[PDB]
Design a protein around this ligand. Structure first.
Ligand SMILES: O=c1ccn([C@@H]2O[C@H](COP(=O)(O)OP(=O)(O)O[C@H]3O[C@H](CO)[C@@H](O)[C@H](O)[C@H]3F)[C@@H](O)[C@H]2O)c(=O)[nH]1
Ligand SMILES: O=c1c(O)c(-c2ccc(O)cc2)oc2cc(O)cc(O)c12
Ligand SMILES: [K+]
Length: 443
């Protein structure tokens, strides 16, 4: 019986798909163990036999609050750099656990480049998992290597991405200031080691499907030389609420869903602009979130608009017939869920690799419309708030704009292809079989 150990970073966006991968492996009669920390254990226990191993996270040692065991909670350069020091200090526990258990494979988070050598100490192959699209993997590497943002003179000047079979235009504002304004050696070295681990390790597991982005599934393997397996969307593996009853009464494709993911850190002025745009648009909506609402808002929109304050059942909402569009930050799990539900998206990237995912959705898949956000940053400065008019424009365009029906038709195709990829005989099913067979024969 093969044993594969999974080691995601403590971020919801990596933890949930890593659990889905562990489940996909477990369904093939592979023993799957997931490493996490105490304050994150519930996330897996609730979601779940896949075994959990708890490591101690040295928060105090790196100057974090004891309760800061997840990446979303480390807001700001100081806290973020401390968090990465902290996770780097898990290496001793990882190596002790590997020596003790001797698994056949380690699937480790992109943020752990050192995991490669930790596994090599015991002749164990290591796979990298990023939780993002082939397109983002390729675009980030081409930007890192060719630095096409050096050839510009203004924040808004458009440059093309080198080498790609599509002409993808981007601007400096869409890149972290740490890369183009005031170089911090720390982030740059971090990114270098991450991208290098893709070639130094045994290979890369990708939560995507070949038919979704074939040019980039190929580019990653050919022009960039990585060994990769596409096994996603991994969430389809394992496959009421008051808002769903609320939706049952409504016209097909008539409601807009708005949600900014797990890393959502949104300020009151921004929410205020969103509220005004939603009211002015006349569109029915489910919005996942006085000081941030127009007075009388929730009563004025009753029956047409719903604000969800807690966790929303995002997949169940997107797959409800009444939901016709998705305003998203273009985190890859949300983007994939929109694709699998066949729901067109208004793209609102914030940080990380979300601006690359936005390019994939709008220019290549052609299933979305941009809201107009073009500034990369962890937190929103009040001077960068996206205004009511842009938001209303996007809300109208995604429902009744030019090519809106075409976007709906294209997304329906991708929905079909996604389900086909994961069923027996599909490309993702097949690549998972291929990967597991390769792991079973490793010497
Ligand atoms: O109210 C809610 C809110 C969310 N969810 C679910 O949480 C998931 C969100 O993952 P997503 O990629 O969109 O957000 P996030 O964790 O911020 O992205 C980081 O992780 C991503 C993956 O690596 C990365 O692409 C991105 O750049 C990072 F910022 C997604 O599966 C939703 O369905 C829900 O069910 N109910
Ligand atoms: O792929 C990526 C990714 O998954 C994550 C991520 C970041 C924060 C989270 O909370 C969860 C995930 O960030 C990234 C940052 C990059 O510069 C490049 C990437 O490719 C990713
Ligand atoms: K090359």
């Amino acid at each position: 019986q093969l044993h594969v150990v999974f080691f995601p970073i403590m971020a919801h966006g990596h933890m949930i798909p890593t659990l889905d991968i562990a489940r996909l492996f477990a369904a093939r009669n592979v023993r799957a163990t997931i490493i996490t920390t105490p304050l994150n254990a519930h996330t897996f226990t609730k979601a779940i036999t896949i075994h959990l191993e708890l490591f101690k996270f040295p928060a105090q040692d790196v100057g974090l609050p004891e309760g800061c065991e997840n990446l979303e909670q480390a807001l700001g350069s100081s806290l973020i750099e401390k968090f990465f020091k902290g996770v780097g200090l898990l290496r001793e526990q990882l190596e002790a656990y590997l020596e003790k258990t001797r698994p056949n494979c380690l699937v480790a988070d992109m943020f752990f480049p050192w995991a490669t050598d930790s596994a090599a100490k015991f002749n164990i192959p290591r796979l990298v998992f990023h939780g993002t699209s082939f397109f983002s993997l390729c675009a980030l590497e081409v930007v890192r290597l060719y630095e096409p943002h050096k050839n510009v003179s203004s924040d808004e000047e458009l440059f093309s991405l080198p080498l790609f079979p599509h002409d993808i235009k981007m601007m400096r504002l869409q890149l972290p200031e740490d890369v183009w304004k005031h170089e911090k050696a720390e982030g740059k070295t971090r990114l270098k080691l991450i991208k290098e681990s893709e070639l130094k390790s045994y290979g890369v597991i990708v939560n995507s499907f070949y038919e979704l982005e074939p040019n980039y599934a190929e580019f990653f393997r050919k022009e960039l030389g990585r060994r990769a397996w596409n096994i996603g969307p991994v969430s389809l593996c394992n496959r009421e609420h008051e808002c769903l009853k609320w939706l049952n009464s409504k016209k097909k494709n008539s409601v807009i869903y708005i949600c900014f993911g797990s890393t959502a850190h949104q300020i009151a002025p921004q929410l205020y602009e969103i509220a005004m745009a939603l009211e002015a648009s006349g569109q029915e909506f489910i919005w996942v979130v006085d000081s941030w609402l127009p007075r009388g808002f929730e009563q004025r929109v009753e029956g047409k608009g719903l604000i969800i304050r807690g966790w929303a059942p995002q997949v169940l909402i997107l797959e409800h017939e009444a939901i016709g569009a998705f305003v998203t930050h273009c985190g890859w799990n949300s983007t994939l869920e929109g694709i699998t539900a066949g729901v067109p998206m208004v793209t609102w990237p914030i940080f990380a690799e979300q601006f690359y995912n936005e390019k994939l959705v709008n220019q290549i898949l052609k299933i979305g419309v941009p809201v107009g956000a073009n500034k990369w940053s962890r937190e929103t400065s009040i001077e960068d708030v996206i205004k009511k008019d842009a938001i209303e424009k996007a809300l109208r365009e995604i429902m009744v704009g030019d090519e809106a029906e075409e976007r709906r038709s294209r997304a329906k195709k991708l929905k079909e292809m996604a389900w086909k990829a994961v069923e027996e005989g599909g490309s993702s099913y097949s690549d998972l079989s291929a990967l597991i067979e390769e792991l079973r024969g490793y010497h």
